[PDB]
Amino acid sequence: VAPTDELEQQLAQVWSHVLGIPQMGIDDHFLERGGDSIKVMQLIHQLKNIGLSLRYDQLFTHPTIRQLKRLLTEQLR
Protein backbone atom coordinates (compact mmCIF):
# COMPACT_ATOMS: atom_id res chain seq x y z
CA VAL A 1 0.00 0.00 0.00
CA ALA A 2 2.86 2.35 0.88
CA PRO A 3 4.98 3.91 -1.89
CA THR A 4 8.52 2.72 -2.50
CA ASP A 5 10.47 5.33 -4.47
CA GLU A 6 10.43 9.09 -3.92
CA LEU A 7 8.63 9.51 -7.25
CA GLU A 8 5.74 7.22 -6.26
CA GLN A 9 5.42 9.29 -3.08
CA GLN A 10 5.25 12.51 -5.11
CA LEU A 11 2.64 10.90 -7.36
CA ALA A 12 0.67 9.81 -4.29
CA GLN A 13 0.79 13.38 -2.96
CA VAL A 14 -0.60 15.00 -6.11
CA TRP A 15 -3.25 12.27 -6.06
CA SER A 16 -4.09 13.09 -2.44
CA HIS A 17 -4.34 16.78 -3.33
CA VAL A 18 -6.73 16.28 -6.26
CA LEU A 19 -9.00 13.98 -4.24
CA GLY A 20 -8.83 16.03 -1.02
CA ILE A 21 -7.91 12.91 0.99
CA PRO A 22 -4.38 12.25 2.33
CA GLN A 23 -2.15 9.17 2.14
CA MET A 24 -3.12 7.56 -1.16
CA GLY A 25 -1.97 3.99 -1.65
CA ILE A 26 -0.63 2.72 -4.97
CA ASP A 27 -3.32 0.02 -5.01
CA ASP A 28 -6.23 2.38 -4.34
CA HIS A 29 -8.33 2.63 -7.50
CA PHE A 30 -8.64 6.18 -8.83
CA LEU A 31 -12.30 5.75 -9.81
CA GLU A 32 -13.01 4.27 -6.35
CA ARG A 33 -11.84 7.40 -4.47
CA GLY A 34 -14.26 9.96 -5.92
CA GLY A 35 -12.51 10.73 -9.21
CA ASP A 36 -14.67 12.59 -11.73
CA SER A 37 -13.67 13.95 -15.13
CA ILE A 38 -13.17 17.37 -13.53
CA LYS A 39 -10.77 15.79 -11.04
CA VAL A 40 -8.94 14.12 -13.92
CA MET A 41 -8.54 17.59 -15.43
CA GLN A 42 -7.06 18.91 -12.17
CA LEU A 43 -4.53 16.06 -12.26
CA ILE A 44 -3.63 16.74 -15.90
CA HIS A 45 -3.44 20.49 -15.24
CA GLN A 46 -1.30 20.18 -12.10
CA LEU A 47 0.92 17.62 -13.86
CA LYS A 48 1.80 19.95 -16.74
CA ASN A 49 2.64 22.53 -14.06
CA ILE A 50 5.13 20.12 -12.43
CA GLY A 51 6.41 17.09 -14.33
CA LEU A 52 5.00 15.58 -17.52
CA SER A 53 1.55 15.33 -19.10
CA LEU A 54 -1.18 12.68 -19.19
CA ARG A 55 -4.16 11.90 -21.42
CA TYR A 56 -7.75 11.30 -20.33
CA ASP A 57 -8.08 7.79 -21.76
CA GLN A 58 -4.66 6.79 -20.39
CA LEU A 59 -6.03 7.21 -16.86
CA PHE A 60 -8.81 4.66 -17.36
CA THR A 61 -6.50 2.03 -18.90
CA HIS A 62 -4.03 2.72 -16.05
CA PRO A 63 -6.47 3.45 -13.20
CA THR A 64 -3.86 2.78 -10.50
CA ILE A 65 -0.54 4.34 -9.59
CA ARG A 66 1.26 1.03 -10.21
CA GLN A 67 -0.12 0.95 -13.76
CA LEU A 68 0.70 4.63 -14.32
CA LYS A 69 4.21 3.95 -13.03
CA ARG A 70 4.64 1.21 -15.63
CA LEU A 71 3.23 3.60 -18.28
CA LEU A 72 6.67 5.35 -18.27
CA THR A 73 6.98 4.67 -22.06
CA GLU A 74 5.85 8.34 -22.42
CA GLN A 75 9.08 9.69 -20.85
CA LEU A 76 15.14 -3.89 -16.58
CA ARG A 77 18.28 -4.36 -18.68
Side-chain angles (χ1 to χ4, degrees), residues 1-49:
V1 184
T4 75
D5 55 68
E6 187 74 6
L7 172 56
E8 290 178 356
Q9 181 176 350
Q10 292 182 355
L11 297 175
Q13 203 180 18
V14 184
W15 270 48
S16 64
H17 187 63
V18 170
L19 304 171
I21 298 177
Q23 282 180 349
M24 295 280 315
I26 298 183
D27 294 321
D28 297 357
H29 202 267
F30 189 80
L31 304 180
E32 295 178 15
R33 294 299 178 273
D36 304 339
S37 52
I38 299 185
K39 295 293 185 179
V40 163
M41 302 204 204
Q42 187 170 13
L43 177 59
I44 299 172
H45 158 238
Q46 295 198 4
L47 275 174
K48 178 62 179 179
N49 298 338

Side-chain angles (χ1 to χ4, degrees), residues 61-77:
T61 323
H62 300 258
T64 63
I65 302 171
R66 166 172 272 179
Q67 294 174 60
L68 180 61
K69 182 63 160 57
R70 227 168 187 262
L71 198 265
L72 196 62
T73 316
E74 290 308 317
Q75 176 181 337
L76 190 57
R77 314 188 188 180

